[PDB]
Amino acid sequence: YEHTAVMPNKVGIPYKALVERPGYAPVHLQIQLVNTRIIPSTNLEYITC
Amino acid sequence: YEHTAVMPNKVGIPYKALVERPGYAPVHLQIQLVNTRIIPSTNLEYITCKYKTKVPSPVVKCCGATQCTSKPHPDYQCQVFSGVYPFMYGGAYCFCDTENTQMSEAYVERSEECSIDHAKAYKVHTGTVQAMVNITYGSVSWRSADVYVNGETPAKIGDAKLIIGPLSSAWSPFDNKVVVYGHEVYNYDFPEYGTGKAGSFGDLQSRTSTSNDLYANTNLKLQRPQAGIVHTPFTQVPSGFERWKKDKGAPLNDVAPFGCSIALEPLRAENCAVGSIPISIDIPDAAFTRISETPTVSDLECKITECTYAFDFGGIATVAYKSSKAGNCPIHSPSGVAVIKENDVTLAESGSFTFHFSTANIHPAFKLQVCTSAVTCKGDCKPPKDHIVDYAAQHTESFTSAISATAWSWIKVLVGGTSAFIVLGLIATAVVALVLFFHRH
Ligand SMILES: *[C@@H]1O[C@H](CO)[C@@H](O)[C@H](O)[C@H]1NC(C)=O
């Protein structure tokens, strides 16, 4: 059963919801981010020393 | 006790009802069709298969000539070819160079594959309709029997006498002519026996697969033998049976309306969802319990806790009650709004019970019958999530099933707006006409 939502981009703050499936009792869902990483693509231009 | 009703011609969908006999507690009745079979009356016209051409040894007359005679063979051919000078392994067969004749013969017969690979042409007329039913009533468990859908032949099912009326529709998937090839049935307008054309389906026709009288119509023509060669060449139109098998198209098995399934022994169309079935079932008198001998149910309150108008039993309701004797109690909803999954419940002195139901209505409002009593259930239903399901709907949708309370408000406002506004003009006209009357008087 697919549950769709939008959670804030926060680390350490859990996203909580009840997954409501017709005919079934709600299932509590908790999604928490441990870390989020922006990993850009880089090309070495040169080395200075 | 006789119970009469009309149930839809739906296989696998149960018919549920309460048998209400005054002075006795209602007995819950459930009738479910296992299968429905339309069995037309068929008459075999002829058998078609791939032909085989028989070619007897030719007669080679040296230094002379012979003549052909007719023979009683299918598509028989005979031709005398003069001026032949055949050779064999031993050299020239005949001495004379020109006074030399070869007589060739050929005729058509059924191929050996005709014993297994052939098509049967049947004339199809109306016939018997049969069905198998699964029936329960009260405390009697499921019993089943094969019945005739004619309204005249009774059946004894679990000591109950059932009479099934004729289908409300005379529809049948078979035309007046069908061709049975293998497991497939075709609505093919085959040519009558003796009128088949070369290269077409009926080029070869036989009344039976063992008949000694075979009709064949091919352009079997004897050709002149090649110079110096002893053989019997001929030309003939390719078999129309093999041609038909290539072009036979979609069988009735694949195109029959109403989901009909086609079976061959006997030829019949099964589980066609057409019309309705009048019924009459006699419930034994011993199955009824007097009112005073059954528990009394009152103080009913029905709460719908969940509802989706899905094809499955998407609704759930909880019914609070108070009752005496704490016995078993039949449950039924006579309204077409919702179909109840449970047939009966076990009651305590006081408490509540739940039941499941299926409905197409966005706002269900239905009467639930509880043995000797009844309660009205109302609620709202959500749309289903699945676009496509692999099971048929348990409920029947009505004209107003989709109309929401918001839609009803708009419909009532538009109707009420014009009704009040038009009447206002009519009222104003009637009053002003009277005012002018009093101006004169
Ligand atoms: C009648 O219904 C019951 C339902 O459990 C089933 O077990 C039984 O096989 C059915 N009878 C036939 C002939 O299908």
Residue type, B56: P
Mutating to test ligand 1, I would choose from B144, B271, B341, B343 the residue with most ligand atoms within 8 A of its C-beta, which is B144
CB B194 within 8 A of CB B186: no
- Give the burial string for B32-69 (b: 16+ CB within 10 Å, else e): bbebbbbbbebeebbbbbbbebeeeebebbeeeeeeee
Residue whose CA is at the smallest distance from ligand 1 atom 7:
B142
Instruction: Count CA atoms within 13 Å of residue B100 on its CB side.
Output: 18
Using what technique was this structure determined? cryo-EM
CB contacts < 8 A (A, B): 12
CB B178 within 8 A of CB B188: yes
Closest-CA distance, B384 to chain A, in angstroms, reads 8
Strand pairing partners for B52? B109
Residue A44 φ/ψ, nearest 5 degrees:
-65, 120
DSSP characters over B70-118: --SSTT-EEEEEES---EETTEES-S-SSSEEEEEEEEEEE-GGGGTS-
Q: Which residues of chain A does B310 touch, with a Cβ-Cβ cutoff of 8 Å?
A: 22
CB contact under 8 A, A23 and B316: yes
- Give me the long-range contacts of B254-262 (CB less than 8 A, separation at least 24): B256/B173, B257/B173, B258/B171, B258/B173, B260/B38, B260/B173, B262/B173, B262/B184, B262/B185
Q: Which of B304, B305, B306, B387 to mutate to test the interface with A (most CBs of A within 10 A)?
A: B306
Residue whose CA is at the smallest distance from ligand 1 atom 10:
B134
**What is the rounded distance in angstroms from the CA atom of residue B352 to the CA atom of residue B386?**
32
CB contact under 8 A, A22 and B314: yes
Residue whose CA is at the smallest distance from ligand 1 atom 14:
B34
Residue type, B29: L
Q: Which residues of chain A does B389 touch, with a Cβ-Cβ cutoff of 8 Å?
A: none
Closest-CA distance, A33 to chain B, in angstroms, reads 29
Residue type, B79: Q
What is the rounded end-to-end Cα distance, in angstroms, of chain A?
57
Closest residue by Cα to residue B18 from B368, B285, B325, B290: B368
Strand pairing partners for B286? none
- For residue B34, the ligand 1 atom closest to its alpha carbon is 14
Q: Which residues of chain B does A23 touch, with a Cβ-Cβ cutoff of 8 Å?
A: 306, 308, 312, 314, 316
Q: Which residue of B has its CA nearest to A22?
A: B308
- Give the burial string for B287-297 (b: 16+ CB within 10 Å, else e): bbbeeeebbeb
**What is the rounded distance in angstroms from the CA atom of residue B109 to the CA atom of residue B54?**
7
Written as six digits, the tokens of B316 are: 């759930």
Closest residue by Cα to residue B397 from B357, B369, B358: B358
CB B230 within 8 A of CB B88: yes
Residue type, B412: K
Residue whose CA is at the smallest distance from ligand 1 atom 4:
B142
Q: Which residues of chain A does B312 touch, with a Cβ-Cβ cutoff of 8 Å?
A: 23
CB contact under 8 A, A22 and B306: yes
Q: What angle do CA B68, B70, B74 make, to 5 degrees?
A: 125
Category of B293 on φ-ψ map: left (φ > 0), alpha (ψ -120 to 50) or beta: alpha
CB B360 within 8 A of CB B393: yes
Residues of chain A with a CB closer than 8 angstroms to some CB in chain B? 22-23
Closest-CA distance, B385 to chain A, in angstroms, reads 8
Locus of tokens 């070495």:
A44
Closest-CA distance, B360 to chain A, in angstroms, reads 15
Q: Which residue of B has its CA nearest to A2?
A: B385
**What is the rounded distance in angstroms from the CA atom of residue B325 to the CA atom of residue B293?**
9
Closest residue by Cα to residue B173 from B89, B272, B239: B272
CB B350 within 8 A of CB B328: no
Residue whose CA is at the smallest distance from ligand 1 atom 13:
B144
**What is the rounded distance in angstroms from the CA atom of residue B89 to the CA atom of residue B229?**
11
SS3 label, residue B427: helix
| CB contact set of B330 (below 8 Å; sequence gap of 6+) | B18, B25, B26, B27, B28, B343, B344, B369, B370, B371
User: What is the resolution of the experimental data for this entry, in Å?
Assistant: 2.9
- For residue B144, the ligand 1 atom closest to its alpha carbon is 13
Locus of tokens 């094809």:
B311
**What is the rounded distance in angstroms from the CA atom of residue B202 to the CA atom of residue B243?**
11
DSSP state of A42: -
Mutating to test ligand 1, I would choose from B142, B144, B157 the residue with most ligand atoms within 8 A of its C-beta, which is B142
CB A20 within 8 A of CB A26: yes
3-state DSSP helix/strand/coil percent for chain A, to nearest 5? 0, 25, 75
Q: Which residue of B has its CA nearest to A25?
A: B306
SS3 label, residue B241: helix
**What is the rounded distance in angstroms from the CA atom of residue B330 to the CA atom of residue B378?**
20
Residues with CB under 6 A from ligand 1: B 34, 134, 142, 144
Closest residue by Cα to residue B9 from B303, B298, B260: B260
**What is the rounded distance in angstroms from the CA atom of residue B357 to the CA atom of residue B364?**
10
Written as six digits, the tokens of B382 are: 């959500």
